[PDB]
Ligand binder design. Structure first.
Ligand SMILES: [Zn+2]
Lengths: 304, 34, 42, 353
């Protein structure tokens, strides 16, 4: 359909396949295929349990991958349950994904900065860290070893900086792995995103089954304070008569503007007001033949 | 063709045939589709 | 939807609701009731 | 009209009426009001008194007196004294009164600056080309006998309700409705208006009609094609908004009022069909023959012949004998109509009380 919709669908499919397990992928692909889904429809499609979908819905709601709609409807049997509708807010979802990956790369840069700090020291007995600044204030009179404040034990060296390049390697091993994500957001930032909602998502849903208990029609409430074309093929012989018909209308236009008979002439002298060629043409046709032979549930309705 | 207005709740399209005339029922869910 | 504008990156989301959002009278012409039509529009 | 034709902001415009009394706060602007409120000698309200003090204490550069023919009245004369205005322009259409005080407007407002030539405007299509006419309705034998043995006040009612005038009005309504014309039938007598409207099945508008019913009837007259005839009393003579009409039938009138005659003619002079070639509006003054209605009718027509209009007499209508239904054709029906017309003439003690 819309190519930008395809790009955001592939982006949402990619982020769940990488950083999330298989059940999360199944839930998000169910929502991306059938754009409007309820709890019963999701359970029927996935054959999933109520307790099984708990952590999955919690994690996709915590990352704003799935938005929830709390609309309740009125089925004919009046045994209505407050069904939740799972859908996707496309600009909210892509903004959440962008913010999450930006915070991840910022945290990785901060971890690289922390590992770029020197090794420091750690006491194996009391399990306490000591920076290189406070190690020098704790060295012995022999100027040979750094002694602990409490245990009075020689400090062993940590590895802050030995694995720092490894973090950079981890940085590298993230970036190509996040390369299809950033390339997708280029076309997203260069194009316009239509902000969808529950009413917008109802224009592109896919029916999960024939008999769905959840009704997709929106029910508004009062008090909540949160043309046709026709052508005429004419043989140009009747059309002249049609002009004559227009002449008839013109004659009517002469009657509408006609001066009344009492206005055009004086009414004084009148009394006061008070209480056969067909056989001939057949013979010509026979003569034509002779000459040719010789020479050769009910509601309101509106008609639209 | 009998069609339902947007003010009504149920969307349904009635078809009338010619020669007993045949009548068909076509109900829909979305107003743009109608 | 708007903190991205603070950090320069373009947000695809329009700002949500949370930021900034909200006789009959008598008739004298009783002889021809049902003949006159209502005109609430021109 | 001020906010449409010229570049005047609504914040410079103020209205002094009963509902609206807020004035413009700028150093200059426009204020529009009525003769009655400005010249009200009665105990007016405090807000209206403050607005009147604002009008009197402000030196105005221009006053526009619409319908200046009512200025020569008793205290409508004083509106030029209570308002200090440098220039006074009186706009009118009917500059005649039955008394001589219409000659006092040169003393009140100023000299008569411009006369519009109504034939010159009609021949250029600016106003409609009306065909003024006066239908002579003869009074019947039993009606004219009662006309002579009666006082003038009852005579006034009795010459209106002659059955020949009913037949003439019905025939003219039918003929001009077949032509597709919007018709206004004027009659100052309220009882005659109601009787004609009930007999002919047409809406009637008079003083006691509610405002919403008047608006509904006028909207049906403007748009619904089944309502092409409206019966109007002296409400239509004065300044009320009406749809465009091309035919007028004057059943009765207020004595020899030339102003009312020209005001009635002015309600068919602005028709939309003036651009159509050969279009003519129609003005009928149905009068009872050999009555005092002839005298008053000639007096009213005396102003329009000064403008140039020629009232052609109509003593015969072609289609009198061949119309399907004639109102009061049988002699017994006419006798019943005649006898119907003749029949017309301490917070605790407060609860116990
Ligand atoms: Zn220690």
């Amino acid at each position: 359909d819309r190519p930008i919709d395809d790009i955001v669908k592939n982006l949402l499919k990619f982020v769940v396949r990488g950083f999330y397990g298989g059940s999360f992928v199944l839930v998000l692909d169910a929502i991306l295929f059938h754009s409007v889904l309820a709890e019963d429809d999701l359970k029927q499609l996935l054959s999933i349990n109520k307790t099984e979908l708990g952590p999955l819905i919690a994690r996709l709601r915590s990352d704003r991958l799935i938005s929830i709609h709390k609309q309740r409807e009125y089925p004919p049997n009046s045994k209505s349950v407050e069904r939740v509708y799972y859908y996707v807010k496309y600009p909210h979802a892509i903004d959440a994904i962008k913010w999450k990956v930006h915070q991840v790369v910022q945290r990785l840069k901060d971890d690289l900065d922390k590992n770029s700090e020197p090794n420091g020291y750690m006491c194996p007995i009391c399990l306490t860290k000591y920076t290189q600044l406070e190690a020098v204030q704790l060295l012995n009179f022999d100027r040979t070893e750094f002694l602990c404040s409490l245990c009075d034990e020689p400090l062993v060296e940590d590895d802050s900086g030995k694995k720092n390049k490894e973090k950079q390697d981890k940085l590298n091993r993230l970036m190509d792995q996040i390369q299809p994500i950033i390339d997708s957001l280029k076309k997203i930032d260069d194009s316009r995103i239509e902000e969808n909602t529950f009413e917008i998502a109802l224009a592109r849903l896919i029916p999960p089954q024939n008999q769905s208990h959840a009704a997709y029609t929106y029910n508004p409430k009062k008090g909540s304070t949160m043309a046709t074309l026709h052508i005429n093929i004419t043989t140009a012989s009747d059309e002249v008569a049609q002009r004559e018909l227009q002449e008839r209308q013109a004659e009517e236009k002469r009657k509408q503007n006609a001066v009344p008979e009492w206005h055009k002439q004086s009414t004084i002298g009148k009394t006061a007001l008070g209480r056969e060629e067909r056989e001939n043409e057949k013979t010509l046709n026979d003569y034509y033949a002779a000459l040719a032979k010789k020479q050769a549930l009910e509601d309101e309705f509106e008609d639209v | 063709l009998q069609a339902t207005p947007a003010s009504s709740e149920k969307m349904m399209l009635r078809l009338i045939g010619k020669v007993k005339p045949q009548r068909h029922m076509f109900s829909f869910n979305n107003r743009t589709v109608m | 939807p708007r903190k991205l504008q603070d950090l320069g990156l373009k947000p695809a989301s329009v700002d949500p609701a949370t930021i900034k959002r909200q006789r009959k009278g008598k008739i004298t012409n009783t002889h021809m009731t049902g003949i006159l039509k209502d005109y609430s529009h021109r | 009209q001020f906010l449409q034709w010229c570049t005047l902001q609504p914040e410079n415009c103020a209205v002094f009426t009963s509902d609206n009394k807020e004035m413009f706060q700028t150093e200059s602007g426009l204020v529009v009001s009525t003769y009655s409120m400005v010249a009200n000698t009665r105990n007016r309200s405090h807000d209206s008194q403050k607005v009147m003090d604002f009008l009197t204490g402000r030196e105005w550069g221009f006053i526009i007196l619409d319908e200046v023919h009512v200025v020569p009245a008793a205290m409508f004369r004083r509106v030029v004294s209570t308002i200090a205005a440098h220039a006074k322009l009186g706009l009118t259409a009917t500059l005649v009164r039955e008394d001589d005080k219409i000659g006092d407007l040169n003393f009140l407002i100023g000299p008569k600056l411009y006369e519009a030539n109504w034939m010159e405007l009609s021949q250029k299509g600016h106003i409609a080309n009306v065909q003024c006419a006066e239908v002579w309705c003869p009074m019947t034998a039993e009606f004219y006998q009662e006309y002579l043995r009666e006082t003038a006040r009852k005579r006034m009612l009795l010459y209106i309700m002659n059955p020949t005038k009913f037949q003439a009005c019905q025939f003219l309504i039918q003929y001009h409705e077949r032509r597709g014309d919007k018709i206004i039938v004027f009659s100052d007598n309220v009882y005659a208006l109601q009787e004609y409207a009930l007999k002919m099945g047409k809406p009637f508008i008079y003083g006691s009609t509610p405002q919403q019913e008047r608006m509904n009837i006028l909207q049906n007259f403007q748009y619904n094609d089944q309502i092409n005839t409206i019966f109007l009393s002296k409400v239509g003579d004065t300044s009320i908004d009406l749809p465009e009409a091309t035919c007028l039938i004057q059943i009765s009138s207020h004595y020899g009022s030339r102003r009312q005659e020209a005001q009635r003619l002015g309600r068919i002079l602005r028709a939309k069909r003036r651009n159509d070639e050969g279009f003519n509006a129609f003005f009928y003054s149905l009068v009872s023959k050999d009555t005092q209605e002839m005298y008053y009718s000639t007096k009213r027509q005396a102003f329009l012949v000064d403008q140039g209009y020629a009232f052609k007499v109509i003593t015969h209508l072609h289609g009198m004998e061949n119309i399907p239904n004639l109102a009061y054709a049988s002699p017994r029906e006419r006798r019943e109509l005649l006898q119907e017309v003749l029949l017309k003439n301490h917070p605790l003690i407060r609860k116990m009380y």
